[PDB]
Amino acid sequence: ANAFLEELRPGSLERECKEEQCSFEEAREIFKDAERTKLFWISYSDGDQCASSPCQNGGSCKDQLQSYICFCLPAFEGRNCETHKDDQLICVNENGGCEQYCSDHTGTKRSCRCHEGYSLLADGVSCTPTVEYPCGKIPILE
Amino acid sequence: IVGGKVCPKGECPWQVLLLVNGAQLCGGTLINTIWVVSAAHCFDKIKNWRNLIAVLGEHDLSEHDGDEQSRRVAQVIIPSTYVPGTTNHDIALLRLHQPVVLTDHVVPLCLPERTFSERTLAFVRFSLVSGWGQLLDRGATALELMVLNVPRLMTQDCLQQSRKVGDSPNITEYMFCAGYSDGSKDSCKGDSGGPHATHYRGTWYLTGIVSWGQGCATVGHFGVYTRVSQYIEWLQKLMRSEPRPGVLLRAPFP
Amino acid sequence: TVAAYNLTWKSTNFKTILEWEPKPVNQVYTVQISTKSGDWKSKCFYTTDTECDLTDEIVKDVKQTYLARVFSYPEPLYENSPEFTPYLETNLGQPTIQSFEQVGTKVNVTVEDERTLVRRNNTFLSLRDVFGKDLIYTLYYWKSGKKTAKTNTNEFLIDVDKGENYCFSVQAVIPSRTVNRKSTDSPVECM
Numbered sequence: 001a002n003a004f005l006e007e008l009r010p011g012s013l014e015r016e017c018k019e020e021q022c023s024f025e026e027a028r029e030i031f032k033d034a035e036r037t038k039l040f041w042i043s044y045s046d047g048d049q050c051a052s053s054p055c056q057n058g059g060s061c062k063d064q065l066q067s068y069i070c071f072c073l074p075a076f077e078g079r080n081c082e083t084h085k086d087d088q089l090i091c092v093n094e095n096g097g098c099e100q101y102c103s104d105h106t107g108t109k110r111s112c113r114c115h116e117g118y119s120l121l122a123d124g125v126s127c128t129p130t131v132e133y134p135c136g137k138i139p140i141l142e
Numbered sequence: 143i144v145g146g147k148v149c150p151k152g153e154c155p156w157q158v159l160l161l162v163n164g165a166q167l168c169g170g171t172l173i174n175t176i177w178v179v180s181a182a183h184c185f186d187k188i189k190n191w192r193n194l195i196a197v198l199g200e201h202d203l204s205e206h207d208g209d210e211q212s213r214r215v216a217q218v219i220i221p222s223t224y225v226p227g228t229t230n231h232d233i234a235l236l237r238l239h240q241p242v243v244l245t246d247h248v249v250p251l252c253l254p255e256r257t258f259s260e261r262t263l264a265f266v267r268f269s270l271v272s273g274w275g276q277l278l279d280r281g282a283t284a285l286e287l288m289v290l291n292v293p294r295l296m297t298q299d300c301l302q303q304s305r306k307v308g309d310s311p312n313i314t315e316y317m318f319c320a321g322y323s324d325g326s327k328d329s330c331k332g333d334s335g336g337p338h339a340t341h342y343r344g345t346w347y348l349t350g351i352v353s354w355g356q357g358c359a360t361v362g363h364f365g366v367y368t369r370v371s372q373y374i375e376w377l378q379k380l381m382r383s384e385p386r387p388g389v390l391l392r393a394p395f396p
Numbered sequence: 397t398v399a400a401y402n403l404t405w406k407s408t409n410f411k412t413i414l415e416w417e418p419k420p421v422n423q424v425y426t427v428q429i430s431t432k433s434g435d436w437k438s439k440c441f442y443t444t445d446t447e448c449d450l451t452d453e454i455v456k457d458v459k460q461t462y463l464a465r466v467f468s469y470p471e472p473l474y475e476n477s478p479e480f481t482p483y484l485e486t487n488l489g490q491p492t493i494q495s496f497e498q499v500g501t502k503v504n505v506t507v508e509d510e511r512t513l514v515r516r517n518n519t520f521l522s523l524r525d526v527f528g529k530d531l532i533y534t535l536y537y538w539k540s541g542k543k544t545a546k547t548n549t550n551e552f553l554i555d556v557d558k559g560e561n562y563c564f565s566v567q568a569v570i571p572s573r574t575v576n577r578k579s580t581d582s583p584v585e586c587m
């Protein structure tokens with residue numbers, strides 16, 4: 001920034017761009033060279049995109065040039081960590097974690113089922129044979 | 143089977159051998175003690191309908207052991223929409239005259255629910271195809287049950303990755319491709335009717351039937367299998383039906 | 397409904413997001429990702445956005461080559477994405493000079509080893525943890541003529557002139573690479 005007569009003093013990166021906000025011209029007066037000025041100006045004037053605090057659900061933002069990156073918590077994902085890995089218990093998502101059959105249910109949660117010859121265990125997701133020779137199983141390997 | 147390996151005796155327990163007049167005809171899949179699923183084209187040239195036999199617990203066509211069980215095929219149900227000499231609706235449901243005994247070497251493959259198969263099994267990459275078919279294109283058939291693991295493809299990719307053959311069979315919604323296009327691995331003619339089984343979380347399900355393809359293991363082509371999921375309802379309704387007088391029966395589809 | 401198109405991979409330090417077109421109109425999307433011999437896994441179920449974060453899936457093995465496809469809903473219509481190999485294609489984030497202490501006739505420039513999205517044992521691995529020897533940092537310095545230095549670690553030990561001040565800038569680099577071999581220049585820092 002510029003105040004009365006300060007410009008009489010030689011350039012200074014600290015006093016002008018660190019302790020204050022400096023314009024391109026002021027920056028150019030400290031670095032002189034064109035390339036040096038631009039290499040400094042790209043980052044200096046880019047602006048921290050993490051200011052909006054885009055990363056949701058306790059995620060961490062990492063600033064980049066004209067962009068950011070969110071580091072999410074284990075149970076989250078998505079550009080802004082907006083995705084709840086716990087809100088995906090639908091059948092199309094890995095068969096809803098069901099061992100055999102899966103049935104969606106609007107509102108409530110999905111329910112698992114089994115093929116004839118099997119029964120649903122208490123975990124509500126696994127199936128166990130109810131006959132000596134259930135379909136789909138290979139005796140000499142079991 | 144081309145480019146596969148022998149299926150260790152007992153590890154392909156639902157595989158069926160179909161014979162007509164004592165001669166090898168086709169493969170098939172047991173899905174319960176009474177019913178067998180095979181391919182419709184396997185019966186295009188059958189004349190002696192009272193001479194169809196289904197053998198279970200088979201392995202080595204050159205040595206007899208007590209794991210083998212024979213049953214006359216009391217009924218061959220084929221979709222009314224199937225046309226002999228063609229490929230669409232290549233499926234057949236066979237009723238055994240008498241139930242087979244479930245043993246360590248004779249076990250049925252699970253017939254899955256339609257949505258489970260379309261939504262989950264269909265996206266399981268690899269599945270097993272097997273049979274006593276040719277070991278090479280136009281070659282001789284196998285003495286020991288062969289098995290092969292093949293990757294599945296969505297029809298769009300199949301079509302895009304295959305070389306066009308003028309005036310050839312269309313790949314419909316009742317079919318699906320699987321295998322390799324580098325000419326190394328695929329099922330073959332003698333394997334027709336055999337199972338395309340998918341492994342999912344400890345259990346095996348029936349997802350396909352060896353149906354057709356451009357030669358066997360032809361470069362630029364994939365094997366084509368009947369998409370069983372399109373027939374789940376058709377199969378379940380028929381398995382609850384009353385046996386018809388004659389052997390051959392054409393049932394409407396849907 | 398129309399099939400997606402212009403499927404593009406947006407990855408920096410392994411934060412991998414798949415983007416496509418067009419802006420959905422009476423059609424939603426479902427994404428599937430997989431390795432050549434793996435099963436298809438679905439993501440971003442029935443989303444209306446035209447992007448899908450696939451980070452948690454690809455960091456499971458950054459050296460595998462993944463393929464994705466976007467399904468369109470009013471077999472469904474879909475479009476495949478370009479193959480993506482994280483290790484060889486994820487962009488290197490802009491570096492940050494962590495510090496530098498002069499010691500007589502020499503200066504030690506330290507590059508902060510930024511973190512990546514790759515998780516391991518409940519932690520985020522650094523770019524060094526992931527690439528190891530495949531990564532190098534280059535220094536672009538001058539007296540506040542051009543000068544450069546390169547290190548196989550995260551530090552530079554160079555010669556200078558006390559009384560004289562220098563400005564510095566670094567870049568992350570993976571020599572073996574062909575494309576996306578270098579990151580953008582770090583902010584400038586002066587003595």
Ligand SMILES: CCS(=O)(=O)N[C@H](Cc1c[nH]c2ccc(OCc3cccc(C(=O)O)c3)cc12)C(=O)N[C@@H](CCC(N)=O)C(=O)NCc1ccc(C(=N)N)cc1
Nearest residue numbers: 183227228229310311329330331353354355356357358365
């Ligand atoms: C190249 C001949 S071929 O090798 O025998 N292939 C044909 C299809 C085949 C490929 N290109 C063709 C061009 C004209 C043609 O027949 C006329 C034709 C024209 C238009 C539509 C149709 C139709 O089927 O709808 C049929 C058939 C074919 C074919 O596969 N035909 C069937 C029998 C058809 C029947 N109902 O009798 C057959 O041989 N199936 C056994 C089989 C099993 C596995 C494989 C495998 N995994 N690999 C290959 C074959």
Ligand SMILES: *[C@@H]1O[C@H](CO)[C@@H](O)[C@H](O)[C@H]1O
Nearest residue numbers: 049051052053054066067
């Ligand atoms: C914070 O700022 C970034 C700048 O790109 C923007 O993308 C976010 O939406 C906002 O929250």
Ligand SMILES: *[C@@H]1O[C@@H](C)[C@@H](O)[C@@H](O)[C@@H]1O
Nearest residue numbers: 058059060061071072073
């Ligand atoms: C930044 O990273 C995220 C994942 C959380 O661990 C935050 O607490 C941390 O500051």
Ligand SMILES: [Ca+2]
Nearest residue numbers: 001002016026
């Ligand atoms: Ca000033």
Ligand SMILES: [Ca+2]
Nearest residue numbers: 001002003006
């Ligand atoms: Ca000032």
Ligand SMILES: [Ca+2]
Nearest residue numbers: 007011026029
């Ligand atoms: Ca000035």
Ligand SMILES: [Ca+2]
Nearest residue numbers: 015016019020
């Ligand atoms: Ca001041």
Ligand SMILES: [Ca+2]
Nearest residue numbers: 014015018019
């Ligand atoms: Ca100060």
Ligand SMILES: [Ca+2]
Nearest residue numbers: 025026028029
């Ligand atoms: Ca000026």
Ligand SMILES: [Ca+2]
Nearest residue numbers: 007025026029
């Ligand atoms: Ca000035």
Ligand SMILES: [Ca+2]
Nearest residue numbers: 046047048064
């Ligand atoms: Ca910035």
Ligand SMILES: [Ca+2]
Nearest residue numbers: 202203205206
């Ligand atoms: Ca035998």
